[PDB]
Amino acid sequence: SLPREDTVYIGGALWGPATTWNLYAPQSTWGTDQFMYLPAFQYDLGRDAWIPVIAERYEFVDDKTLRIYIRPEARWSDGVPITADDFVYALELTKELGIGPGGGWDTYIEYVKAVDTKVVEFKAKEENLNYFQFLSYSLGAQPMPKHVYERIRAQMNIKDWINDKPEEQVVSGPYKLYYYDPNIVVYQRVDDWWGKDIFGLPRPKYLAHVIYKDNPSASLAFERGDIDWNGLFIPSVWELWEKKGLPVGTWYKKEPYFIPDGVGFVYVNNTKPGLSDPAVRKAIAYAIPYNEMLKKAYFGYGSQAHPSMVIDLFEPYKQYIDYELAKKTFGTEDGRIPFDLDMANKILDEAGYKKGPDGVRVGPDGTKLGPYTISVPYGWTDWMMMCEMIAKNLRSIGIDVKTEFPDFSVWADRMTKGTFDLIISWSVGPSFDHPFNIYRFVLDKRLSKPVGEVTWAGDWERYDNDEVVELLDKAVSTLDPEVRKQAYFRIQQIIYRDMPSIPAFYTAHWYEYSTKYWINWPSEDNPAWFRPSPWHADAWPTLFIISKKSDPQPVPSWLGTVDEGGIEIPTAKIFEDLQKAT
Ligand SMILES: OC[C@H]1O[C@@H](O[C@H]2[C@H](O)[C@@H](O)[C@H](O)O[C@@H]2CO)[C@H](O)[C@@H](O)[C@@H]1O
């Protein structure tokens, strides 16, 4: 019963049921992090700059001490000021509970301290000084409402709290929950949002997400005009406007249609017998039919990933790849891993795996290579097809793998708790600290948890290597790019030796829009925000950029770097200030 012209309908972001609106719970509902809880500074990948959001300003006291000045206007939706205590509390709670925003901060941050009501100070750890992580955890810090969470902690386990009462929801963002049921989640704009005199208001009054069971049903809704903002895999997407003449668009009008999101992996659980052998993981890498699955399953919307984990779609990242090592190791022109079942079988043969009567390999200890599952969420039809193609090839070489596609919530539980065998999942994307970010997320045991315990922070596969930890600790102890590069090069040697999990393809930043009710969507022709996908962590500025068709507004004046006429601080300026404070 929502007003259509004041509602943005969304697809491809929420899969399975609503769970909670609590970032410390094992699962929370799409929209919670994106729109309800904002950071100190919002990183802008498109401009390589930082929007001062809850923060007004930063200051380096020295190269290891960063003060963040909170806007006087920054205020929770219940009227309580956002204070330095809220920043300290959020991070200390994440450390205590082993889950929540800012996971891992305490590895590279010595302290977070409320030096005044509106001033928070972060101090870098010097033992393993890491300037990227220092900046990431400090500038990107997300406060959480201490006064709310302490009340909850007195009543119950914070992990059990649903936070599902609209009137009582205490948020820092411009939206909060309005309504939900088994078929929809709806958010409503906070009209007296604290940021209204700095950022304006987002244009939609409501954000609604009907819960579709699969891609085909979501696609049908999109074709009917019932989804405005979509983050969906869509086969033959160009035909929506070329053949069907629908008022629909993507970032690119021509192929590949989508900008890149990150790196999709075949994650292989290192804790399971058989899968714990690097030889088996290497064999799996050679048995993935990269080219065929990316054409048939992925419609050419993304290409094969480089095994270094570096996103070589961007020229400036190519310096971080030891191409000679990759070429030497894999025998291909660029060092990508070839699809080669002969090689996969050879690897298993040379590791002492012999096929038994049923055709399944048994190791020299003799661990049987199966039964295993490969799993992705039901309805994610592109990934499901990839899984089927991969599983069949693995069965061919004597690894007993079958597909299993449970509801998203169940899949996510098994991934985060590390009870899976194989899955396809995401990792990280292009960023100011790439490829440090992907090595940290995928390879760092410190971000993992025991099997049975939830981690959203990293290392789902439970890879355990102490040399990687040492290399991550030294990679950015100075800003000399050569030190970083050599750390990355050695990590790459370790990746090829251990095959902790398999970088497979560059994931698409799924993003489609309808112009029927909402206009000025970011695109190649209007590149106002480079992370517009409705499920992306950094989606929120999109909602300030779009207008109602019947009420067009100008571009928000705060957008753009300081030199361009907005309020965004270039990453280069932050590093300039850091070096100057040394
Ligand atoms: O391509 C697989 C699948 O992706 C779905 O979007 C995912 C996205 O790929 C993932 O990185 C992010 O963390 O979650 C979103 C969903 O919130 C997309 O909705 C599907 O159509 C697609 O099959």
PDB file of all heavy atoms in Angstrom, residues 229-250:
ATOM      1  N   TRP A 229      15.581  -0.579  -8.892  1.00  0.00           N
ATOM      2  CA  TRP A 229      16.995  -0.632  -8.555  1.00  0.00           C
ATOM      3  C   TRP A 229      17.361  -2.091  -8.329  1.00  0.00           C
ATOM      4  O   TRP A 229      16.956  -2.684  -7.339  1.00  0.00           O
ATOM      5  CB  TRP A 229      17.233   0.190  -7.287  1.00  0.00           C
ATOM      6  CG  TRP A 229      18.651   0.473  -6.933  1.00  0.00           C
ATOM      7  CD1 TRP A 229      19.729   0.468  -7.760  1.00  0.00           C
ATOM      8  CD2 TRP A 229      19.134   0.877  -5.647  1.00  0.00           C
ATOM      9  NE1 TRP A 229      20.860   0.828  -7.069  1.00  0.00           N
ATOM     10  CE2 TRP A 229      20.525   1.079  -5.767  1.00  0.00           C
ATOM     11  CE3 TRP A 229      18.527   1.074  -4.403  1.00  0.00           C
ATOM     12  CZ2 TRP A 229      21.319   1.469  -4.688  1.00  0.00           C
ATOM     13  CZ3 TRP A 229      19.305   1.463  -3.341  1.00  0.00           C
ATOM     14  CH2 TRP A 229      20.692   1.654  -3.486  1.00  0.00           C
ATOM     15  N   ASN A 230      18.089  -2.673  -9.274  1.00  0.00           N
ATOM     16  CA  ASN A 230      18.280  -4.117  -9.316  1.00  0.00           C
ATOM     17  C   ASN A 230      19.758  -4.470  -9.224  1.00  0.00           C
ATOM     18  O   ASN A 230      20.608  -3.769  -9.766  1.00  0.00           O
ATOM     19  CB  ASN A 230      17.654  -4.678 -10.603  1.00  0.00           C
ATOM     20  CG  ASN A 230      17.153  -6.115 -10.460  1.00  0.00           C
ATOM     21  OD1 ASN A 230      17.172  -6.698  -9.376  1.00  0.00           O
ATOM     22  ND2 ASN A 230      16.698  -6.690 -11.570  1.00  0.00           N
ATOM     23  N   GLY A 231      20.058  -5.558  -8.524  1.00  0.00           N
ATOM     24  CA  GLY A 231      21.420  -6.065  -8.371  1.00  0.00           C
ATOM     25  C   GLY A 231      21.480  -7.534  -8.731  1.00  0.00           C
ATOM     26  O   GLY A 231      22.048  -8.347  -7.995  1.00  0.00           O
ATOM     27  N   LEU A 232      20.934  -7.851  -9.900  1.00  0.00           N
ATOM     28  CA  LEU A 232      20.633  -9.219 -10.287  1.00  0.00           C
ATOM     29  C   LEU A 232      21.511  -9.702 -11.427  1.00  0.00           C
ATOM     30  O   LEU A 232      21.879  -8.924 -12.312  1.00  0.00           O
ATOM     31  CB  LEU A 232      19.173  -9.265 -10.732  1.00  0.00           C
ATOM     32  CG  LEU A 232      18.458 -10.602 -10.601  1.00  0.00           C
ATOM     33  CD1 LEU A 232      18.145 -10.894  -9.127  1.00  0.00           C
ATOM     34  CD2 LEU A 232      17.183 -10.597 -11.428  1.00  0.00           C
ATOM     35  N   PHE A 233      21.857 -10.988 -11.417  1.00  0.00           N
ATOM     36  CA  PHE A 233      22.315 -11.641 -12.630  1.00  0.00           C
ATOM     37  C   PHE A 233      21.113 -11.774 -13.555  1.00  0.00           C
ATOM     38  O   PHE A 233      20.074 -12.303 -13.152  1.00  0.00           O
ATOM     39  CB  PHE A 233      22.885 -13.025 -12.349  1.00  0.00           C
ATOM     40  CG  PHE A 233      23.021 -13.870 -13.589  1.00  0.00           C
ATOM     41  CD1 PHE A 233      24.104 -13.704 -14.438  1.00  0.00           C
ATOM     42  CD2 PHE A 233      22.056 -14.810 -13.911  1.00  0.00           C
ATOM     43  CE1 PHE A 233      24.226 -14.468 -15.590  1.00  0.00           C
ATOM     44  CE2 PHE A 233      22.176 -15.570 -15.064  1.00  0.00           C
ATOM     45  CZ  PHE A 233      23.270 -15.401 -15.892  1.00  0.00           C
ATOM     46  N   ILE A 234      21.266 -11.297 -14.786  1.00  0.00           N
ATOM     47  CA  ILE A 234      20.224 -11.371 -15.807  1.00  0.00           C
ATOM     48  C   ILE A 234      20.838 -11.881 -17.114  1.00  0.00           C
ATOM     49  O   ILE A 234      21.719 -11.230 -17.664  1.00  0.00           O
ATOM     50  CB  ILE A 234      19.583  -9.982 -16.070  1.00  0.00           C
ATOM     51  CG1 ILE A 234      18.937  -9.433 -14.794  1.00  0.00           C
ATOM     52  CG2 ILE A 234      18.544 -10.075 -17.193  1.00  0.00           C
ATOM     53  CD1 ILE A 234      18.357  -8.050 -14.938  1.00  0.00           C
ATOM     54  N   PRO A 235      20.394 -13.058 -17.601  1.00  0.00           N
ATOM     55  CA  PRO A 235      20.841 -13.542 -18.908  1.00  0.00           C
ATOM     56  C   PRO A 235      20.438 -12.586 -20.030  1.00  0.00           C
ATOM     57  O   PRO A 235      19.326 -12.060 -20.013  1.00  0.00           O
ATOM     58  CB  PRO A 235      20.085 -14.873 -19.068  1.00  0.00           C
ATOM     59  CG  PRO A 235      19.697 -15.269 -17.729  1.00  0.00           C
ATOM     60  CD  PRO A 235      19.469 -14.006 -16.965  1.00  0.00           C
ATOM     61  N   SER A 236      21.339 -12.367 -20.984  1.00  0.00           N
ATOM     62  CA  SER A 236      21.050 -11.560 -22.183  1.00  0.00           C
ATOM     63  C   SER A 236      20.456 -10.187 -21.828  1.00  0.00           C
ATOM     64  O   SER A 236      19.431  -9.766 -22.377  1.00  0.00           O
ATOM     65  CB  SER A 236      20.116 -12.337 -23.121  1.00  0.00           C
ATOM     66  OG  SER A 236      20.670 -13.604 -23.450  1.00  0.00           O
ATOM     67  N   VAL A 237      21.113  -9.491 -20.900  1.00  0.00           N
ATOM     68  CA  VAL A 237      20.522  -8.306 -20.269  1.00  0.00           C
ATOM     69  C   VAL A 237      20.197  -7.193 -21.280  1.00  0.00           C
ATOM     70  O   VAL A 237      19.178  -6.507 -21.154  1.00  0.00           O
ATOM     71  CB  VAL A 237      21.414  -7.773 -19.098  1.00  0.00           C
ATOM     72  CG1 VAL A 237      22.735  -7.205 -19.598  1.00  0.00           C
ATOM     73  CG2 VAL A 237      20.650  -6.741 -18.266  1.00  0.00           C
ATOM     74  N   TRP A 238      21.056  -7.051 -22.285  1.00  0.00           N
ATOM     75  CA  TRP A 238      20.882  -6.061 -23.364  1.00  0.00           C
ATOM     76  C   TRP A 238      19.532  -6.141 -24.096  1.00  0.00           C
ATOM     77  O   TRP A 238      19.060  -5.133 -24.626  1.00  0.00           O
ATOM     78  CB  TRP A 238      22.035  -6.167 -24.375  1.00  0.00           C
ATOM     79  CG  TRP A 238      22.137  -7.512 -25.029  1.00  0.00           C
ATOM     80  CD1 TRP A 238      21.526  -7.907 -26.184  1.00  0.00           C
ATOM     81  CD2 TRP A 238      22.875  -8.651 -24.558  1.00  0.00           C
ATOM     82  NE1 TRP A 238      21.845  -9.214 -26.465  1.00  0.00           N
ATOM     83  CE2 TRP A 238      22.669  -9.695 -25.483  1.00  0.00           C
ATOM     84  CE3 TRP A 238      23.693  -8.889 -23.445  1.00  0.00           C
ATOM     85  CZ2 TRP A 238      23.249 -10.958 -25.331  1.00  0.00           C
ATOM     86  CZ3 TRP A 238      24.270 -10.144 -23.297  1.00  0.00           C
ATOM     87  CH2 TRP A 238      24.048 -11.161 -24.237  1.00  0.00           C
ATOM     88  N   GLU A 239      18.909  -7.318 -24.121  1.00  0.00           N
ATOM     89  CA  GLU A 239      17.632  -7.473 -24.814  1.00  0.00           C
ATOM     90  C   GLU A 239      16.462  -6.774 -24.114  1.00  0.00           C
ATOM     91  O   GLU A 239      15.418  -6.539 -24.727  1.00  0.00           O
ATOM     92  CB  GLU A 239      17.322  -8.950 -25.036  1.00  0.00           C
ATOM     93  CG  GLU A 239      18.340  -9.609 -25.936  1.00  0.00           C
ATOM     94  CD  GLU A 239      17.964 -11.009 -26.347  1.00  0.00           C
ATOM     95  OE1 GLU A 239      17.135 -11.643 -25.662  1.00  0.00           O
ATOM     96  OE2 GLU A 239      18.521 -11.473 -27.360  1.00  0.00           O
ATOM     97  N   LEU A 240      16.632  -6.434 -22.838  1.00  0.00           N
ATOM     98  CA  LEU A 240      15.588  -5.727 -22.101  1.00  0.00           C
ATOM     99  C   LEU A 240      15.266  -4.372 -22.738  1.00  0.00           C
ATOM    100  O   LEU A 240      14.105  -3.973 -22.791  1.00  0.00           O
ATOM    101  CB  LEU A 240      15.983  -5.545 -20.632  1.00  0.00           C
ATOM    102  CG  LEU A 240      16.093  -6.836 -19.812  1.00  0.00           C
ATOM    103  CD1 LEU A 240      16.564  -6.533 -18.389  1.00  0.00           C
ATOM    104  CD2 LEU A 240      14.771  -7.585 -19.783  1.00  0.00           C
ATOM    105  N   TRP A 241      16.294  -3.679 -23.224  1.00  0.00           N
ATOM    106  CA  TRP A 241      16.104  -2.390 -23.892  1.00  0.00           C
ATOM    107  C   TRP A 241      16.187  -2.477 -25.423  1.00  0.00           C
ATOM    108  O   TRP A 241      15.491  -1.734 -26.120  1.00  0.00           O
ATOM    109  CB  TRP A 241      17.062  -1.323 -23.335  1.00  0.00           C
ATOM    110  CG  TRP A 241      18.539  -1.581 -23.508  1.00  0.00           C
ATOM    111  CD1 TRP A 241      19.308  -1.264 -24.592  1.00  0.00           C
ATOM    112  CD2 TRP A 241      19.431  -2.164 -22.545  1.00  0.00           C
ATOM    113  NE1 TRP A 241      20.614  -1.630 -24.376  1.00  0.00           N
ATOM    114  CE2 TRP A 241      20.718  -2.185 -23.126  1.00  0.00           C
ATOM    115  CE3 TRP A 241      19.264  -2.685 -21.255  1.00  0.00           C
ATOM    116  CZ2 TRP A 241      21.836  -2.702 -22.459  1.00  0.00           C
ATOM    117  CZ3 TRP A 241      20.375  -3.198 -20.593  1.00  0.00           C
ATOM    118  CH2 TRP A 241      21.641  -3.204 -21.197  1.00  0.00           C
ATOM    119  N   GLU A 242      17.014  -3.383 -25.944  1.00  0.00           N
ATOM    120  CA  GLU A 242      17.186  -3.517 -27.395  1.00  0.00           C
ATOM    121  C   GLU A 242      15.997  -4.183 -28.084  1.00  0.00           C
ATOM    122  O   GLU A 242      15.546  -3.714 -29.131  1.00  0.00           O
ATOM    123  CB  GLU A 242      18.466  -4.284 -27.728  1.00  0.00           C
ATOM    124  CG  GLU A 242      19.731  -3.507 -27.444  1.00  0.00           C
ATOM    125  CD  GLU A 242      20.989  -4.254 -27.848  1.00  0.00           C
ATOM    126  OE1 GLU A 242      20.879  -5.292 -28.536  1.00  0.00           O
ATOM    127  OE2 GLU A 242      22.094  -3.799 -27.474  1.00  0.00           O
ATOM    128  N   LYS A 243      15.502  -5.277 -27.512  1.00  0.00           N
ATOM    129  CA  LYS A 243      14.406  -6.033 -28.121  1.00  0.00           C
ATOM    130  C   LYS A 243      13.064  -5.689 -27.498  1.00  0.00           C
ATOM    131  O   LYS A 243      12.099  -5.416 -28.211  1.00  0.00           O
ATOM    132  CB  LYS A 243      14.664  -7.538 -28.019  1.00  0.00           C
ATOM    133  CG  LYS A 243      15.994  -7.957 -28.619  1.00  0.00           C
ATOM    134  CD  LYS A 243      15.965  -9.371 -29.176  1.00  0.00           C
ATOM    135  CE  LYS A 243      17.297  -9.696 -29.829  1.00  0.00           C
ATOM    136  NZ  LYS A 243      17.336 -11.030 -30.504  1.00  0.00           N
ATOM    137  N   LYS A 244      13.006  -5.695 -26.170  1.00  0.00           N
ATOM    138  CA  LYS A 244      11.749  -5.500 -25.448  1.00  0.00           C
ATOM    139  C   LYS A 244      11.377  -4.023 -25.274  1.00  0.00           C
ATOM    140  O   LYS A 244      10.250  -3.710 -24.879  1.00  0.00           O
ATOM    141  CB  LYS A 244      11.805  -6.218 -24.094  1.00  0.00           C
ATOM    142  CG  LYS A 244      11.953  -7.736 -24.233  1.00  0.00           C
ATOM    143  CD  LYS A 244      12.202  -8.437 -22.905  1.00  0.00           C
ATOM    144  CE  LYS A 244      12.234  -9.958 -23.084  1.00  0.00           C
ATOM    145  NZ  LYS A 244      12.718 -10.676 -21.863  1.00  0.00           N
ATOM    146  N   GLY A 245      12.319  -3.127 -25.568  1.00  0.00           N
ATOM    147  CA  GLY A 245      12.070  -1.685 -25.537  1.00  0.00           C
ATOM    148  C   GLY A 245      11.678  -1.128 -24.181  1.00  0.00           C
ATOM    149  O   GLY A 245      10.974  -0.118 -24.104  1.00  0.00           O
ATOM    150  N   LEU A 246      12.139  -1.781 -23.110  1.00  0.00           N
ATOM    151  CA  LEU A 246      11.794  -1.384 -21.744  1.00  0.00           C
ATOM    152  C   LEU A 246      12.685  -0.226 -21.303  1.00  0.00           C
ATOM    153  O   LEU A 246      13.822  -0.120 -21.755  1.00  0.00           O
ATOM    154  CB  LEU A 246      11.959  -2.568 -20.780  1.00  0.00           C
ATOM    155  CG  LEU A 246      11.155  -3.830 -21.107  1.00  0.00           C
ATOM    156  CD1 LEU A 246      11.615  -5.009 -20.251  1.00  0.00           C
ATOM    157  CD2 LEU A 246       9.667  -3.577 -20.935  1.00  0.00           C
ATOM    158  N   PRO A 247      12.175   0.637 -20.405  1.00  0.00           N
ATOM    159  CA  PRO A 247      12.937   1.783 -19.909  1.00  0.00           C
ATOM    160  C   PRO A 247      13.932   1.337 -18.835  1.00  0.00           C
ATOM    161  O   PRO A 247      13.791   1.702 -17.665  1.00  0.00           O
ATOM    162  CB  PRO A 247      11.849   2.678 -19.318  1.00  0.00           C
ATOM    163  CG  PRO A 247      10.848   1.718 -18.796  1.00  0.00           C
ATOM    164  CD  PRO A 247      10.843   0.565 -19.778  1.00  0.00           C
ATOM    165  N   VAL A 248      14.930   0.564 -19.260  1.00  0.00           N
ATOM    166  CA  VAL A 248      15.891  -0.078 -18.367  1.00  0.00           C
ATOM    167  C   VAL A 248      17.317   0.178 -18.858  1.00  0.00           C
ATOM    168  O   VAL A 248      17.546   0.346 -20.056  1.00  0.00           O
ATOM    169  CB  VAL A 248      15.625  -1.607 -18.290  1.00  0.00           C
ATOM    170  CG1 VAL A 248      16.828  -2.355 -17.722  1.00  0.00           C
ATOM    171  CG2 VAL A 248      14.366  -1.888 -17.467  1.00  0.00           C
ATOM    172  N   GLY A 249      18.270   0.217 -17.930  1.00  0.00           N
ATOM    173  CA  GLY A 249      19.666   0.437 -18.279  1.00  0.00           C
ATOM    174  C   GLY A 249      20.630  -0.231 -17.320  1.00  0.00           C
ATOM    175  O   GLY A 249      20.233  -0.751 -16.280  1.00  0.00           O
ATOM    176  N   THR A 250      21.893  -0.222 -17.718  1.00  0.00           N
ATOM    177  CA  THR A 250      23.010  -0.760 -16.951  1.00  0.00           C
ATOM    178  C   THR A 250      24.098   0.318 -16.941  1.00  0.00           C
ATOM    179  O   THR A 250      23.922   1.377 -17.552  1.00  0.00           O
ATOM    180  CB  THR A 250      23.534  -2.064 -17.592  1.00  0.00           C
ATOM    181  OG1 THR A 250      23.665  -1.874 -19.010  1.00  0.00           O
ATOM    182  CG2 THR A 250      22.564  -3.216 -17.342  1.00  0.00           C
TER     183      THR A 250
END
